[PDB]
Every structure is written in structure tokens, then in C-alpha cells.
């Protein structure tokens, strides 16, 4: 028992069509290993200034017979600064024809995000706290836990295949692994946080140099680029020719020339001899205006986002606290086994 789900490459994010409610209201929502809550855009939501939040499906609780309004306010803030608020609820959730009943979700009535987010991380990272810092509702079974508890999948685990940079679609598989879509063997890496799907990154090879790291890296489907601590990012920037630019009182971004040569690769070395090679095409990101960001950015939180994850096949196993990785093989061939 595996559940395959198509990932829509939206550019900065990967999203899937799922349904919510007794009447199977279709939502296109970001698939996010870096958060743990599933929330949907209410049909009467007030979008954030300049945000078109109702273009990727909306949810009308009043037309679902199964919708339950829990007591309780919902609030979340993401790493990029965007936020969503609303109320906690429960309803039926349907993922490629597989339904789970009474799944706790949030009905969001105000947001600066463009669409809903299906957070599939650990339950201990659920946004169950208000802006006073107080826990306002208990930790709860999120979507992957409920899939397991209702007998849909054997293990709380899922495999991620974002597919190639130009691809319209990839695939996430709950409770399974597609053995046709990687070369070599999947190497298991120990998760190093009890809250976040981080693994130890030993080093990065770039432009013929090896840069020792030796700290955790979040493997986040819901981050567009790659983030490293300021001093390490600056060591890499020195080889790449990326230039730090102050964009706000406390925000700096690496820019790079749009016509910069993108030949070569960057190699990421993890535990147990596991190795992912990323083409340097992944390090030039086009902004609207004829400037480009470098694919690496500074942050106190280390994150390997989509521009890394496109080049790995990953089996996240939240029961075993492992993420198993191998170099991706782009192919329509498929041979899925249950995990």
C-alpha cells in the first residue's frame, strides 16, 4: 500500500491537488517537508496585500457536512516571513483517491501565502502556539501519521522525486519508494533533530575545492533555494563570484550575473559515503527584472531546498528517523515497493 501523488512544478514551489470535505473540494497545495500542518484557503479569506491567494482552489466549510470547527485559533509564520491565520478544524482529506476521515486541518481566513500548504513533517513541529508563545491546542496526528493510523500506509514515510528542473511534474509517494528512479543504492542517513528533517552534511565541493561543514541541513521541499550560515556561504560565494547585496535593514541576498557560466557541478557529501551531485545551472535564479539571485543564500538555519532536492531521490522515514538518499535518475520507468 503506497500512495503516489503528482507534484506540480510551480516554479518556486511544488504543489499537489488534494480534496477536502464531504463534497471533495479541490485544493492545490504546497507539499512541504519543512512544516507539519495542513491548512486551506477559506473561500471568504482576505488575502494579504498584493497576494492572489484564491487562485489555487478554496475551501468552503459550510458546504462540507463533515467539517468540524474546533475551538481554537490557528497561526503560523514561515521562514520567509509569510503568515497564515484562521481556525483549527477537522474534515475528510482525499489524496489520489485515498480518504482519511477526521483529519485535523486549519481553515485559513487571512494569509500572505499564495495557496494552502500540506505540511508533512514531524508532529513536534506543528504550529500550535500563539504569538505570546503559549501552546493553545495539543499536538495532534498530522496527515502522514493519520495515513498510517487509518491503515493506508504501513510506515510514516514518503519518497520525494521533484524531477528535473524543466519538468512540469514530479511525484511524492506516501508509504513507498520508486526503485527505478535512482542510481546506486539508497544510503540511510540519521535524522539529527527531533523536530526537523535534518541530516548531517559533512562537506561541499565547489569549483575544485572542498569545504568542510559538519552540521545539520534541513531537507526542505518547501524551500526554493539553498541556505547556509553567513561565513560558510561567503566561502562558497568567493569561488562562485556571487555578490552580497543589502535588500532591507537586516536582509542580505547573494546576486549573480544572469549570464554567468553554469557548467560544472556542486557535490554534497553526507554520512556513510552518500553523495549528491547538483549541476551548477541550479545556482542562477531569474528574478522578474533581469537580475538573478545566486542559488545559495545566507541564513543561521541551513536548508537544502528544491535546487538541491531535484538531484536526489529521497526516502524520508519519520518512524525510523532516517532519510535515505541516492543520486536521482530521471525516468518514466517505475518500480515501486511498499515501505
Amino acid at each position: 500500500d503506497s500512495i503516489s501523488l503528482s507534484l506540480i512544478n510551480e516554479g518556486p514551489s511544488y504543489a499537489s491537488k488534494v480534496s477536502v470535505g464531504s463534497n471533495k473540494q479541490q485544493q492545490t497545495v504546497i507539499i512541504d517537508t519543512g512544516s507539519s500542518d495542513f491548512w486551506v484557503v477559506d473561500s471568504n479569506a482576505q488575502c494579504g496585500k498584493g497576494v492572489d491567494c484564491k487562485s489555487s482552489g478554496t475551501f468552503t466549510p459550510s458546504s462540507s457536512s463533515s467539517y468540524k470547527n474546533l475551538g481554537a485559533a490557528f497561526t503560523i509564520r514561515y521562514g520567509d516571513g509569510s503568515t497564515s491565520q484562521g481556525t483549527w478544524g477537522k474534515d475528510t482529506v482525499t489524496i489520489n483517491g485515498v480518504s482519511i476521515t477526521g483529519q485535523q486541518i486549519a481553515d485559513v481566513t487571512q494569509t500572505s501565502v499564495d495557496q494552502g500548504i500540506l505540511g508533512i513533517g514531524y508532529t513536534s513541529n506543528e504550529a500550535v502556539y500563539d504569538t505570546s508563545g503559549r501552546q493553545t491546542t495539543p499536538n495532534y496526528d498530522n496527515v502522514p501519521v493519520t495515513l498510517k493510523k487509518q491503515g493506508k500506509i504501513r510506515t510514516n514515510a514518503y519518497s520525494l522525486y521533484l524531477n528535473s528542473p524543466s519538468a512540469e511534474t514530479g511525484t511524492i509517494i506516501f508509504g513507498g519508494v520508486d526503485n527505478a528512479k535512482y542510481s546506486g543504492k539508497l544510503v540511510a542517513e540519521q535524522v539529527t533533530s527531533s523536530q526537523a528533517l535534518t541530516i548531517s552534511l559533512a562537506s561541499v565541493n565547489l569549483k575544485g575545492s572542498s569545504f568542510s561543514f559538519g552540521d545539520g541541513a534541513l531537507l526542505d521541499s518547501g524551500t526554493t533555494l539553498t541556505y547556509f550560515p553567513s561565513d560558510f556561504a561567503a566561502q562558497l560565494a568567493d569561488k562562485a563570484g556571487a555578490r552580497l547585496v543589502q535588500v532591507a535593514r537586516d536582509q542580505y541576498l547573494y546576486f549573480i550575473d544572469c549570464n554567468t557560466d553554469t557548467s560544472g557541478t556542486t557535490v554534497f557529501n553526507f554520512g556513510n559515503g552518500a553523495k549528491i551531485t547538483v549541476p551548477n545551472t541550479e545556482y542562477v535564479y531569474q528574478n522578474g527584472d533581469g537580475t538573478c539571485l545566486w542559488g545559495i543564500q545566507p541564513s543561521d538555519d541551513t536548508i537544502l531546498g528544491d535546487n538541491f532536492l531535484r538531484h536526489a531521490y529521497l526516502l524520508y522515514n519519520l518512524d525510523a528517523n532516517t532519510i535515505s538518499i541516492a543520486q536521482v535518475k530521471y525516468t518514466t520507468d517505475s518500480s515501486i515497493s511498499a515501505v
Binding site: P12, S13, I30, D32, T33, G34, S35, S36, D37, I76, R77, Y78, G79, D80, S82, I117, G119, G121, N125, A127, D220, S221, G222, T223, T224, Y227, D301, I303, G305
Partner: peptide, 5 residues
């Protein structure tokens, strides 16, 4: 974008 800390 950057999805929760």
C-alpha cells in the same frame, strides 16, 4: 519561498 522554524 521558505516553508517552519
Amino acid at each position: 519561498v521558505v516553508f517552519a522554524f
